[PDB]
Amino acid sequence: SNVRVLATDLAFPEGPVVMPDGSVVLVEIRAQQLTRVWPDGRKEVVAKVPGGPNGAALGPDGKMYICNNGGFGWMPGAPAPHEYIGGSIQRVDLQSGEVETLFDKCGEHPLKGPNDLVFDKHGGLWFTDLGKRRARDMDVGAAYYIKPGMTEITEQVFGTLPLNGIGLSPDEATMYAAETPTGRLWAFDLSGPGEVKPKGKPICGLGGYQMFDSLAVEASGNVCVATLVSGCISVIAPDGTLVEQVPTGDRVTTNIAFGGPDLKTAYITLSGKGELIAMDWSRPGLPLNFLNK
Template sequence: MFGESNFRLVGSGLSCPEGPVVEDDGSVLVCEVRGAALVRVSPGGSRTVVANLPSGANGAAIGPDGAAYVATNGSFTFADVEGITHITGLIEDWVGGALYRVDRTTGEVRELFTESEGQHLGSLNDVVFDADGGAYIADTTSGLLHYAVPAERRIGVAVSDVVTPNGVGLSPDGSRLYVSETFTGRLRTFEVVGPGKLLPLPDVFQHPAAAQDDTEGIDLQQSKQFWDGLAVDGEGNLVVADLASSGVRVVSPLGAELAFFETPERDPYVTCVAFGGPDGRTAYVTSGGRGRLYAIDNWPFEGGRVNFQP
C-alpha cells in the first residue's frame, strides 16, 4: 500500500507547521515552529492565530480540562531554499523550551514548566496525554522523556536513555509508549507500568535507510534525519512522519511495515500526524518545509483517537 493519491490539501501558507490537533468541528490546531504560534486551520483552509508563543511551537495535545498544552523549542534559525523552509540550528542565545497551557477559546497563554528535576527543559517536541491526565513530553536536545501532571504542577524525568526523541504515542490500551528517535531511525517501545513509569522493551522498527552504526556523540547539526512525529491508529499501528522519505510510514506493533504514503511534493520536513473525523479515519499530516496541512481520507486501518480529544 504505497502512493501519494490519498493526500488532500487542507491548508497552506503556514509557518513551518507541526503538532496537529484535531478539534470536534473538523478544525485543526497546528503548531507553527517558525511562526511561534498556535493556529487554527478551518475545514475550508483559513488560518487564524489562537495564541502567540514566546518561541517556536513544536508539539501540542488537548488535556483533561479542554485546554491545549503546547511544547516549545526555544527557537531555531531558518533558511528558505527553493520553496522549502529548512531548520538550520538553534538561535545564538538559546536557553531551551517550555510547556504552556493555551485556552483554545480566549487564547490565554500560561507558562507551566521551564525545568524538570532542576534542569532546564531542552528543545521540546511531541506531547501525549495518558488516561490519568499526565503528559509524556519528548525533549529532543536533552535526550529525555518528561512526565508532567499539569493539574498538580508536577513534572519529572520518565526516561533518560533516549537519543533525539521526537514523536511520542500511546497504544490504544495505554500499555505501551512509542518513541521515534530522529537521528538513529529507531522506533522505541516502553511498557507503561504506572503513570510516568516506563520499562524499555525491544525496538519495534528501524528506518530502512538508517545506518547501523554507533549513535553516541551525535552532532545535532550534522546527522541525517529519519523520523519526526508519530501517531497511533485504532489498530495500534505506528504512523510515523518520515523525514528521509517525505511521507508517512505505517508500522504494525509487531514491527511489520504496512504502508507508505508519499507527499505530492517532496518535503524533507514532513513533521507530524494526527487523526480526526467522526470515525477517526482522517489522518492529518503537516508538511513543515512547504507550509502545508494535508489530509489522508479513508484511512485504510481502524481510525485513531487520543485521550481527551474533543
C-alpha cells in the same frame, strides 16, 4: 487515498490537533504561533507563543498544551544563543489566547527542546525532549511524564539520541517514542500510568537514509510515523513490522493526526511546503484522550 490541501503559506506547520468539527489547531514553529484552520478554508491565529512551539495536545481543562522547544535558527537549525529562550511546557486558552508556562525544568535540570506530547486517560502528560544542537555538541534525547493535575514532572527515559514523536498504545500499557536521526521507533513498557519498567527497545529501524519526526497511533495499535528524507508516513505494527510507507510529496513531513468520520482521515503537516493536508486512511485512528473520547 484522496489527498487534499487544507492550508498553505504556513510557517513550518507542526503539532496538528484535529477537533471534532474537523477544524485543525496547529503550531507554526517559525511564526511562533498557534493557528486554527477551518474546513471552509479560512485561518485564524489563536495565540502568539514566543519561542518554538513544536507540538500540541488538548488537555482535560480544555486548554491546548504545547511543547515549546525554545526556538530554532532558520529549514530549522541550531539556535544561535539569542534565538533560544529555554524549553518549556505551556498551556494556551483557546478563547483568550493567554499563554501560561507550566514547567521549564525537571528537578535541577532545565528542559532543552520539548517536542511532542500525549495525554493518558488520567490526565497525565507524556512528552519528548529532542534536545538542542550547539556548535560542536548536542543534547541527548529524553522523555518525561507530568503527573495528573500538573503536580510533578518526572524523567522516565534519558540518554537516547533525540526523541520526537510520542504516543500510547490503545490499552496505554506501552509508550512509543520515535528516535529522529536513526529512524528507530522505541517501545517502553509501562508498569502503570506514567511509569516505565525496564529501559525500552527499538522495535523497528528503517533502512537507508531516513529519519523520524512525529507520530499518531491507530485503533489497531499500529504506529504511524512521519518520515523525513524519504517523505512518507511509516506504518509500524506493534510487533515492529513495517506495514507500509505512504508517500506525501514532501521530504520534510513532520506530523500526522487522525480525525473526521470514524477518525479515518489523516491530517499531515508538510513542513517543507508549508502545507496542512488531509488524506483518506484505510484504518481508523486511536481516539485521543480529552479530544476524541
